[PDB]
């Protein structure tokens, strides 16, 4: 029950990107679910600040917050997008769109 990568299928029409993304209709974004708490896992790759914060949160839960599970590396997808001239263009590596790694931060 710790920080890891789960599935998240994102339909572009739901987020209102349909007016400038022809295809695909949906894609697999993934998301990062899971607690950042001790005992920690081997591959959350946690920062020292995350560790410190998680501990101060144990001592002072009402004041300080836990560290979050977040994407630590991202991947491109390809998209077929409406050009300002109204000409379908391909964006081969549309950066930052899918999750490669999660971690505590």
Binding stretches for Na ion (CB under 5 A) = 60, 62
N residues, the chain? 105
Owner of token pair 């679910």: 33
- Rounded to whole angstroms, the Cα distance separating 97 from 31 reads 11
- Of the candidate residues 14, 48, 59, 87, the single one contacting Cl ion (CB under 5 A): 48
Taking the CA atoms of 93, 95, 99 and 104 in sequence, report the sign of the dihedral they define: positive
User: Residue 99 Cβ, how far from Cl ion at the closest point, in Å?
Assistant: 12
Closest listed residue to residue 6, CA positions, set 50, 63, 92, 71: 71
Number of residue whose CB is nearest Na ion: 62
Residue 97 sits in the site that holds its own copies (CB under 8 A): yes
Do residues 76 and 5 lie in contact, with contact meaning Cβ atoms separated by under 8 Å? no
Residue 24 sits in the site that holds Cl ion (CB under 5 A): no
Residue 21 sits in the site that holds its own copies (CB under 8 A): no
- Rounded to whole angstroms, the Cα distance separating 59 from 23 reads 49
Residues lying near Cl ion in the complex (CB under 5 A): 7, 9, 38-40, 47-48, 65, 92-93, 95-96
Residues at the site binding its own copies, with contacts judged by CB under 8 A: 8, 10, 14-16, 29, 31, 33, 47-50, 52-53, 55-56, 59, 64-65, 67-68, 70-71, 74, 94-99, 105
């Amino acid at each position: 029950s710790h920080c890891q990568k789960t599935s998240l299928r994102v339909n572009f029409e739901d987020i209102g990107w349909d007016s400038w993304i022809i295809a695909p209709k949906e894609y697999e974004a993934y998301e990062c679910r899971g607690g950042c708490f001790f005992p920690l896992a081997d591959d959350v790759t946690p920062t020292k600040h995350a560790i410190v914060q998680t501990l101060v949160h144990l001592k002072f839960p009402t004041k300080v917050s836990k560290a979050c599970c977040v994407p630590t590396k991202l991947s491109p997808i390809s998209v077929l997008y409406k050009d300002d001239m109204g000409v379908p263009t391909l964006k081969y590596h549309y950066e930052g769109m899918s999750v490669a790694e999660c971690g505590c931060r």
